[PDB]
Motif scaffolding. Structure first.
Motif, PDB file in Angstrom:
ATOM      1  N   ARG A 109       4.133   6.660  -7.442  1.00 50.30           N
ATOM      2  CA  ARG A 109       3.658   7.994  -7.915  1.00 50.30           C
ATOM      3  C   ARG A 109       4.055   9.117  -6.917  1.00 50.30           C
ATOM      4  O   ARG A 109       3.281  10.037  -6.665  1.00 50.30           O
ATOM      5  N   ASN A 110       5.295   9.055  -6.399  1.00 46.48           N
ATOM      6  CA  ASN A 110       5.760   9.927  -5.281  1.00 46.48           C
ATOM      7  C   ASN A 110       5.739  11.456  -5.606  1.00 46.48           C
ATOM      8  O   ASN A 110       5.186  12.253  -4.832  1.00 46.48           O
TER       9      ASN A 110
ATOM     10  N   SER B  45       2.237  12.616  -7.094  1.00 49.77           N
ATOM     11  CA  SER B  45       1.397  12.448  -5.874  1.00 49.77           C
ATOM     12  C   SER B  45      -0.007  11.845  -6.169  1.00 49.77           C
ATOM     13  O   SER B  45      -0.348  10.774  -5.658  1.00 49.77           O
ATOM     14  N   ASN B  46      -0.814  12.539  -6.991  1.00 51.17           N
ATOM     15  CA  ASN B  46      -2.197  12.133  -7.316  1.00 51.17           C
ATOM     16  C   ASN B  46      -2.236  11.102  -8.474  1.00 51.17           C
ATOM     17  O   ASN B  46      -2.525   9.920  -8.252  1.00 51.17           O
TER      18      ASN B  46
ATOM     19  N   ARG C  39       2.636   1.375  -3.564  1.00 50.98           N
ATOM     20  CA  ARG C  39       1.676   1.791  -4.608  1.00 50.98           C
ATOM     21  C   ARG C  39       1.640   3.341  -4.730  1.00 50.98           C
ATOM     22  O   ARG C  39       1.500   3.885  -5.834  1.00 50.98           O
ATOM     23  N   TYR C  40       1.760   4.041  -3.584  1.00 52.44           N
ATOM     24  CA  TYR C  40       1.923   5.513  -3.566  1.00 52.44           C
ATOM     25  C   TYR C  40       3.381   5.928  -3.917  1.00 52.44           C
ATOM     26  O   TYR C  40       3.600   6.954  -4.564  1.00 52.44           O
ATOM     27  N   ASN C  41       4.364   5.130  -3.470  1.00 48.44           N
ATOM     28  CA  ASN C  41       5.810   5.380  -3.734  1.00 48.44           C
ATOM     29  C   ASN C  41       6.113   5.341  -5.264  1.00 48.44           C
ATOM     30  O   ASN C  41       7.043   5.990  -5.750  1.00 48.44           O
TER      31      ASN C  41
ATOM     32  N   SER D 111       0.846  -1.224   0.000  1.00 50.49           N
ATOM     33  CA  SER D 111       0.000   0.000   0.000  1.00 50.49           C
ATOM     34  C   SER D 111       0.884   1.279   0.000  1.00 50.49           C
ATOM     35  O   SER D 111       0.570   2.268  -0.676  1.00 50.49           O
ATOM     36  N   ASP D 112       2.007   1.227   0.747  1.00 51.78           N
ATOM     37  CA  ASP D 112       3.019   2.312   0.768  1.00 51.78           C
ATOM     38  C   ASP D 112       3.735   2.435  -0.601  1.00 51.78           C
ATOM     39  O   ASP D 112       3.946   3.538  -1.105  1.00 51.78           O
TER      40      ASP D 112
ATOM     41  N   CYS E 246      -0.593   9.443 -12.505  1.00 51.47           N
ATOM     42  CA  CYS E 246       0.654   8.895 -13.107  1.00 51.47           C
ATOM     43  C   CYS E 246       0.714   9.169 -14.624  1.00 51.47           C
ATOM     44  O   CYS E 246      -0.315   9.424 -15.260  1.00 51.47           O
TER      45      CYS E 246
END
Length: 74
Positions: free
Chosen positions: A62-63, A66-67, A58-60, A55-56, A69
């Motif tokens: 698109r760091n 942020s929102n 999956r956001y990392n 889950s971390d 891709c």
């Protein structure tokens, strides 16, 4: 029954354990349950620490943006 523990209370995933989780993300970004059990075997982690990490990551993925891709599938 020989090893009575596999439960890391607030224990940090070492670079080796965390890198095995990376191998699972590179092959498929949404891991199958049998692959997650295989990670618990190699690393010695819990299925909870693993589900947390992806889950971390999956956001990392698109760091900076942020929102959303680039090359988004439609």
């Amino acid at each position: 029954s020989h090893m009575p523990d596999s439960f890391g209370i607030r224990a940090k995933k070492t670079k080796e354990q965390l890198a095995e989780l990376k191998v699972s993300y590179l092959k498929n970004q949404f891991p199958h349950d049998s692959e997650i059990i295989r990670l618990m075997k190699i690393t010695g982690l819990t299925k909870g620490e693993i589900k947390k990490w992806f889950s971390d990551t999956r956001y990392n993925q698109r760091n900076s943006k942020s929102n959303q891709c680039l090359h988004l599938n439609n």
